[PDB]
């Protein structure tokens, strides 16, 4: 490293996203080199053995660690305010590696009712198949978590804003509940916010997981994830969760593209939220739109909590139309600028129907209990000029 | 696809490794394009829903599937003689995703006593922590597997040659034992051999796992894996093991580099084994070397089985010196051509001490039971001229 | 996907993301990296038709590649030109265009203040091949008209241009170039980008760029572009690049420029926002003798900067109240500003030509070229302006 | 890691893997991809010293890059030259070397049979810039000596060369070039590679390559090299590439060539092994009128092929007992041989110049250039020779 985290404390977010974690190499390359290698050479046989026993620093194998990935891990941990970070080949790889490491057969988990489709599948149809009981509750009211707590509850998993409806959860209050019992941790999926908007570790969370694929990469060309938290737990996830349980190690090439994307994280998040506030206001005033969910609108139920724990309201807008699923299909198909695709946190504005697409693993009974309407549309607002996004949505909504 | 697997049946190995699985795209690029994307665009909202319900072919998200990865999966399945394949971000990702999918709490596994370090850790300290009993046996004698079989044994995991000592296991006889019980499968780790040398599916295995990092990539710059088997099981590993349990999805860039490496798989394996037969004979005749384990030497215990199930003897040579660990260190450090590093299946000849390096998770009690000597040296013979590899080893061994 | 006619009414950011992009058979959101050398023909007739220019399609990457085509169409749409052709460097674009447009016996009227290597290519390159070149102070357009000759086939200008960032009225120079029948105006729009300045609309025939700088924006690709009429761009593609220079761009590098262009509007806005703040600070600072920046009211050509540039840019040249020793002290004292050549990157780059670039030059030679003892060129990055200003203050306060 | 002196006694494969490689601070086995545009100086003095050539180090990727340096040293070691400089294309290497070595008023004696674009660069390029070029039948060296003039500063040759793969005795032409004081011999060693032919040892001053072909070997990188004395290579780096052409190679493309070179010996051996088998088959086949291949005893310059080439190469030109229509039928009938231009790839490429490359040319123009109605150039790949021969047999049997 060149910029120490002590020097980085007084620096701004954009400055840290560019210079923090970066290492001054022998050639002095401005860009972090792509150390696209599988194995590393030891100077002596004794060095190799010391490296395996944790007695000497250095690299051994890319699944264990790589210098391109180290710069990215150090950079993410500095922004989130965590001791250490470990990158994975996907957002689900980060979620699974952390939960496989922190849990064992006989443990209990209190998870939020509204979660990302595959996360719900991993908890309901994955961890339950391996002798781990999971209780899903409406996390908006923290008292439901307190009620579902048990003497064997070793972890609490939350996601705020919840994908897709954007239901918020007070992190600081849930951390107080998690820390009431001796052996219990709070895992927060900070994919939607990024450390620019929200930092759950500072609010009380022990572990923070991300789907780097979305806003941290920002260019929709890398499937990746991160696990941020205390060094003691991150070393366990690196040498057990990824090394043995999942095998979800990130490629040095993909890690370089995330480093490249992070250089513009502050300016991308500012434009993303600037456009989303303008699009959400337009949707709220439009006749064809029945209800708009966005933390920036005064009509949002948890508007006071959005101001308290989020720097900006985000880029995602969930909304319901004055019509069934047929009306929603007509809007999606009429779009010429808004791209009809899955995923979020990209320069292209993406749009989709969560009932049949993202939250498809959820059965219709579980879907409606969480709050997914047959006709809800989730909009991931991109970096295009808000004038063109609004014009495209207007010509599509005016037809219905 | 351009070359159908019916046309590919009569073609040779090198021809299949170059043309099989390749798709003729709209531009007609000779090289497979690197579709470095995270999400894919649907032509209509109905198309998206049909794609998620499995009613229409096409792509949705790179974690689920990608066209660069599809060409590689089709190519590997054709060479191995399997119905389908699914790529992962690491060799351990392929092992874990297949075992997480095939097993549940209450199941039993009969695993080989000599296995790769992290595989042993995933079975002994991973699956056991999640209510799955595992019995390790000397798989060289198949009767030990038959004795360890139980009414709940849903899988048998084997690796032949076993890393590092190179102990062989008759696949056809173990498959007959696995198929005696209704719900039991045989998983074979064909990393060392590759489908050019050994094809366990044809011998009887249900599932074949690989660590693409080693000989299939061949250039030591990609950490990757594969799960080959019946389409029914491969779809379950793709949409459950990788999608939810591990998150070990392969990057399209890394997948392209494996496709690039496969173009020379036949010529690399031939040179690798050509040099290894010459190095092993030299080591056997050298005074300082006590015992050499290599399937090509007539001194090998399972020499008849090596001829029956392997096309060539491979590139790995395990050997013991007429001296302790100090003598082995002196040999490793004296090397100028043989690179002192971990991993195998690369142009550079790699050399290491398994006791302190690869099989370090094994405790000294478990290590000696499997057959790992304090002083054993595993040599991954590269593609350099055998004259220079032998000359380098001679000047190092003559000093002791 | 998005036709040039539909893109006309769209904003800059929207065009930089969606214009030029092609909807492929798989529907990848990101443009695929067609990393290939040659392309396959469906029949022998198809190959012949493509070589005769009768049928559309690809033949070889040096001639053309689909990743590069998307980038070329995108750049031509933003600049308002008919066609574009990418090169492996900024100098490759400059040389390929001039080698194509000129022959032995022709004359060129070039600006006196140009990029170091451009001046070398004109003074030592084209003169060595029977091409006379007259260098003039292009700020006053009357000097260009005086240096015009009956054989002047081209006029090369760069605005702004080092050392003091002087400007050239493009519309006035185009009127001079078009007074003679066979004469063109080539403008190096590297500093401005089509977001700030579009010389084709003002009158220029050809526009060259060094994509390495602001168009890529991440300092990891050496690349260039030649924009102009299709008739001349086809000649540069099939003669200048194909035969004279061989400066063809890699599809991988082309993809990274496409990735960088997704945030061009937001990067240029932040770059100029920070530069206006840094320039005002430097002007008010005691240790700074003079500041050259098109945004300050003290700038000589302030009216022309507002007339032909949307924003004043990101480059700031400034004189110190001190010699070469003071300039060395300031640069070495920097802890945020990076000591490196080049411009248009997230990292703020700082250079002192007297002690770094023009160091072989003697003091007499330096002053003839226009490099003073305390001249410092600053390429303002995307970090928070408060941290850039704080770093410059602690360095400049030491020399008071 | 491996010095040029230690590499002297090592074999070709060993040098192609270990020579030129640099032991970096992390000890990565694979050469890192230093994908950067600019490099950071530790002090203002360091930057100045590097610009004055007094201190070693990097400044900008167009000038030099560490990934490219490892590749340049590796190529120069194999060719037996003092220094090498990489370019973004084969034509970039040819043009940069000729632009550097020549000036207006100089004369060049070039071979009559050369690569299409090389002939265009000499006949239409250099002649347009006051450089006279005389083309002669280089098979008889007396024609070169007759075309020599007091201003002949260079002689350009290519051996073997299309259409009929004619050879040129390098050692005899070097004696002619060195008879005059200021004259050099440039040899295009694309077809042979330093494994088959090393023109510097035979007498050549400069050796140019199109790395796209056999050195890369995987048909995914357009690149070139200029090998020769350090004095001339420094001039080509800091004048030919830096200013005249701008043909600098990308670090990513340079890495892929390094990856491809790891298997150069084994690829060239298989390429020539298959080509000798295919050429013998074609010679004995009834529908084939004549076969040009340096390995057949029917070859005119068979003694010279054994004298200056280790192996006869992978390219086979052959005449059919039929016109253009028969040649079209044969190519369209192929199911394994790929219809594409270029050479030196795992896929066997087949081309019929009469109906594909020289299709704009009329029949009278085709015969003057040397392209007959039934001439077919075949770049033999790495597939099994039995499948290549079987594919050619079913295509040639249809035209009997
Ligand atoms: C099911 C994979 C696609 C889901 C996507 N990650 C989203 O949340 O939009
Ligand atoms: C522990 C990671 C390195 C082990 C390496 N995969 C080998 O088998 O040699
Ligand atoms: C080769 C000199 C590099 C100078 C650098 N391109 C600049 O903009 O200052
Ligand atoms: C631009 C023409 C391409 C021809 C190709 N390089 C060949 O070797 O035939």
UniProtKB/TrEMBL annotation, chains A, B:
Known catalytic reactions: L-methionine + H2O = methanethiol + 2-oxobutanoate + NH4(+); L-homocysteine + H2O = 2-oxobutanoate + hydrogen sulfide + NH4(+) + H(+)
GO biological process: transsulfuration
GO molecular function, one term: methionine gamma-lyase activity
Alphabetic keyword roster: Lyase, Pyridoxal phosphate
CDD domains linked to this entry: CGS_like
Listed PROSITE patterns: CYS_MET_METAB_PP
Coiled coil: none
Swiss-Prot/TrEMBL cofactor(s): pyridoxal 5'-phosphate
Entry's EC annotation: 4.4.1.11, 4.4.1.2
GO cellular component, one term: cytoplasm
InterPro entries: Cys/Met-Metab_PyrdxlP-dep_enz (IPR000277), Cys_met_metab_PP (IPR054542), L-Met_gamma_lys (IPR006237), PyrdxlP-dep_Trfase (IPR015424), PyrdxlP-dep_Trfase_major (IPR015421), PyrdxlP-dep_Trfase_small (IPR015422)
Residues recorded with modification N6-(pyridoxal phosphate)lysine: 214
Origin superkingdom: Bacteria
PANTHER family membership: CYSTATHIONINE GAMMA-LYASE (PTHR11808:SF80), TRANS-SULFURATION ENZYME FAMILY MEMBER (PTHR11808)
Protein family per UniProt: Belongs to the trans-sulfuration enzymes family. L-methionine gamma-lyase subfamily.
Name this polypeptide is given: L-methionine gamma-lyase
Source species: Thermobrachium celere DSM 8682
């Amino acid at each position: 490293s060149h910029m120490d985290r002590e020097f980085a404390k007084n620096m701004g977010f954009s400055t840290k996203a560019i210079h923090a974690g970066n290492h001054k190499n022998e050639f002095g390359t401005l860009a972090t080199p792509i150390y696209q290698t599988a194995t590393f050479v030891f100077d002596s046989a004794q060095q190799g053995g010391n490296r395996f026993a944790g007695k000497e620093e250095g690299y051994i194998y890319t699944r264990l660690g790589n210098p391109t990935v180290t710069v990215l891990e150090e950079k993410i941990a500095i922004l989130e305010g965590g001791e250490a970070c470990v990158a994975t080949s996907s957002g689900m790889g980060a979620i699974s590696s952390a939960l496989w490491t922190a849990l064992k057969a006989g443990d209990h988990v209190v998870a939020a009712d509204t979660l990302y489709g595959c996360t719900f599948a991993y908890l309901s149809h994955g961890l339950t198949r391996y002798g781990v009981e999971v209780t899903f509750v409406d996390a908006s009211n923290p008292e439901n978590i307190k009620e579902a707590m048990r003497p064997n509850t070793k972890a609490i998993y939350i996601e705020t804003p919840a994908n897709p409806n954007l239901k918020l959860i007070d992190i600081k209050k849930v951390a107080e509940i998690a820390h009431s019992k001796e052996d219990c941790i709070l895992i927060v999926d900070n994919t939607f916010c990024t450390p620019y908007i929200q930092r759950p570790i500072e609010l009380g969370a022990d572990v923070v997981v991300h789907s780097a694929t979305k806003f941290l990469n920002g260019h929709g060309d890398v499937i990746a994830g991160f696990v941020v938290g205390r060094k003691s737990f991150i070393d366990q996830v690196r040498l057990y969760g990824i090394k043995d349980m999942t095998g979800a190690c990130l490629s040095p090439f993909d890690a370089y593209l995330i480093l490249r994307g992070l250089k513009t994280l502050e300016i991308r998040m500012e434009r993303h939220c600037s456009n989303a506030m303008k699009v959400a206001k337009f949707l709220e005033e439009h006749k064809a739109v029945k209800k708009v969910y966005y933390p920036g609108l005064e009509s949002f139920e948890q508007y006071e909590l959005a101001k308290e724990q989020m720097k900006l309201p985000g880029a995602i807008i969930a909304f319901e139309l004055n019509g069934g699923v047929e009306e929603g299909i007509k809007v999606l198909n009429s779009c010429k600028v808004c791209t009809l695709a899955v995923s979020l946190g990209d320069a292209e504005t993406l749009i989709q129907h969560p009932a049949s697409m993202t939250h498809s693993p959820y059965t219709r009974e579980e879907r409606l209990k969480a709050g997914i309407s047959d006709g809800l549309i989730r909009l991931a607002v991109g970096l295009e000029n808000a004038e063109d996004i609004i014009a495209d949505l207007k010509q599509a909504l005016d037809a219905i």
